């Protein structure tokens, strides 16, 4: 039973990752073939860059605005920038815009989507000028909808580029997002790559490589079938036709945390296709605190638990080649359930052989994944992704359980946020202590016991030397991405 379980875990997890790697390679080959047909200085899709933020660092907001202004795409309509402000503390952030683009900030008294005439002409009168909208604070969906209306005002706009407030775009990060929209008539949305730049703290570095894996191996595989489930928040283009069609149903959803997931699922439900372009890069920061990361992950997992049913229900709309979407959703559910069941069974049946074999198998699977990541990114630091196998067991599984319990129920705030996490940590510690107490003997004459002790000690040495390598990298500042070094230098200069 245990041997079969740990054998399945290693062919059911590494096998699908190999399949995703192959599909991602095929998708990248297809995109390279498309790009090789792109003529020089190509620009045929008028875009309207949309930036929506609530309370961002003035430095990071200025960097994002300057990065948008640095884009080399030769066909941009405007820079509709919606801010959930209209307050004294938030006005300062809008001032950043006034020192980067212009003093064309507008202060409408009402939010467009909560108005009787939800049309762009109520706020803006001139469509040929960059505009900053200081609408009342209601959320990100409301500001994105106001941006959608202001973009749809222009009859010459064919696409809309959505960017987070603190996303430092690359130079060709607009040309490579909106190009695939013209490659196929069926493609109505494109998701660009988002790379973490603040890779200094351990959690931030592990999350950076999780982002890289999820965008290059998990989103590319879906992009091969043109069924990307979630367009990246920091960067993504939408055709103006599909956004005009789905801006009404996406809003008034009956609600606050999905944001881009519901938009992408709407594009899927309409029957259209979404691709992913790894050649378009947008840098964004990652959470550093473990508690804040757990809160963010439980919000994301609540949104995922809400949207997986709508994603599954739209798999028939795509007919054939839509089996991959339903299979991916089913695999996502069964992976978490199988991990929980296998680890609970292993903890309950305190066998040192099974526990050590499970640890070694998981470490080897993560090592193979990180090896492919290092090959793909041409970066050795990708092997730090091995340590990410800790985060999934301490910051993700409790997040999944908390999201499931909150969805099932549909100092109290602390208990609602951190009580399954603390209970999970106490349970893991208790399982370890019970395994140590029960299996408290030393028999250096059994091959099986020799294997168990040698394996656990070698794994401990492996993670210790990986952590030592990370520590010497941090003190050497080798871990910092070049963008992080540039941003730190410029912030110190200020």
């Amino acid at each position: 039973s245990a041997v079969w379980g740990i054998s399945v875990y290693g062919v059911f997890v590494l096998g699908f990752y190999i399949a995703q790697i192959v599909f991602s390679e095929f998708n990248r080959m297809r995109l390279s073939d498309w790009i090789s047909l792109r003529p020089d200085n190509w620009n045929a899709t008028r875009v309207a860059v949309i930036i929506a933020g609530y309370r961002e660092d003035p430095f990071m907001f200025k960097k994002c605005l300057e990065s948008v202004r640095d884009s080399e795409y030769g066909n941009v309509a405007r820079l509709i920038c919606v801010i959930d402000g209209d307050e004294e503390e938030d006005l300062k952030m809008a001032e950043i815009y006034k020192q980067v683009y212009n003093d064309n900030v507008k202060k409408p008294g009402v939010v467009l989507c909560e108005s009787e005439n939800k049309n762009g002409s109520t706020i803006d009168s001139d469509v040929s000028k960059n505009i900053c909208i200081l609408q009342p604070h209601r959320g990100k969906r409301e500001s994105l909808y106001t941006g959608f209306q202001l973009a749809s005002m222009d009859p010459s706009v064919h696409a809309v580029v959505l960017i987070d407030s603190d996303t430092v775009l690359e130079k060709n990060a607009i040309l490579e997002v909106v190009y695939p929209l013209s490659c196929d008539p069926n493609i109505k949305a494109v998701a660009g790559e988002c790379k973490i730049w603040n890779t200094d703290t351990i959690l931030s570095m592990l999350v950076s490589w999780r982002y890289f894996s999820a965008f290059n191996v998990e989103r590319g595989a879906q992009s091969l079938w043109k069924t990307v489930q979630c367009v990246g928040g920091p960067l993504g283009a939408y055709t103006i036709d599909i956004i005009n069609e789905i801006k009404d149903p996406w809003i008034t959803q009956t609600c606050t945390y999905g944001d881009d997931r519901r938009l992408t699922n709407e594009v899927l439900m309409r029957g259209k296709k979404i691709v992913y372009t790894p050649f378009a890069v947008g840098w964004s920061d990652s959470p550093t605190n473990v508690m804040r990361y757990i809160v963010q992950q439980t919000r994301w997992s609540k949104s995922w638990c809400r949207e997986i049913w709508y994603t599954l229900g739209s798999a028939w709309k795509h007919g054939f080649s839509g089996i991959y979407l339903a299979f991916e959703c089913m695999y996502q559910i069964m992976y978490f359930f199988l991990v929980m069941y296998l680890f609970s069974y292993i903890a309950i049946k305190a066998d040192i052989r099974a526990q050590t074999a499970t640890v070694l198998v998981s470490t080897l699977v993560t090592i193979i994944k990180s090896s492919y990541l290092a090959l793909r990114a041409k970066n050795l630091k990708a092997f730090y992704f091995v340590l990410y196998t800790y985060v999934y067991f301490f910051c993700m599984i409790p997040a999944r359980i908390t999201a499931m319990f909150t969805m099932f129920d549909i100092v109290w705030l602390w208990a609602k946020q951190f009580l399954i996490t603390y209970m999970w940590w106490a349970g893991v510690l208790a399982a370890g202590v019970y395994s140590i107490v029960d299996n408290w003997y030393f028999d250096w004459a059994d091959i099986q016991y020799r294997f168990a002790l040698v394996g656990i000690c070698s794994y401990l040495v492996f993670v210790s030397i990986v952590l030592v390598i990370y520590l010497i990298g941090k003190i050497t500042t080798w871990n910092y991405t070049p963008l992080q070094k540039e941003l730190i230098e410029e912030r110190y200069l200020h």
Partner: nanobody
Framework: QVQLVESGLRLACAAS????????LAWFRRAPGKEREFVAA???????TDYDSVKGRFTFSRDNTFNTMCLEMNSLKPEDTAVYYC????????????????????WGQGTQ
């Protein structure tokens, strides 16, 4: 905040300050005492435009690495004599590329 200084036949202008890739730089000519005339324009990334009279004889080139640019008078004649100005137009107010000297807000000193 950019200061443009042009020297100089092959005229060349250096612009001190940060130039975003979306700025559009143009060369204008001022006839002796009537009004400025358009000569050429191009963004900091490509897509150059030229006047009707100036077509194929003057080539627009930008360094893109040292914030300098040059214009080549491969077929200069006494007919097209004027004072040459180099101007920057930021896409700070509008992205609409225009042929109007009033739209450009940063100007260099006239040459020749």
């Amino acid at each position: 905040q950019v200061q443009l200084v042009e020297s100089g036949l092959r005229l060349a202008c250096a612009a001190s300050g940060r130039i975003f890739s979306s700025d559009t730089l143009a060369w204008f000519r001022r006839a002796p005492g009537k009004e400025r005339e358009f000569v050429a324009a191009s963004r900091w990334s490509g897509g150059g435009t030229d006047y009707d009279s100036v077509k194929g004889r003057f080539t627009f080139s930008r360094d893109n690495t040292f914030n300098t640019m040059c214009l080549e008078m491969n077929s200069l004649k006494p007919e097209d004599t004027a004072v040459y100005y180099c101007a920057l137009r930021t896409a700070r107010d509008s992205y609409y590329y225009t042929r109007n000297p009033t739209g450009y807000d940063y100007w260099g000193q006239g040459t020749q």
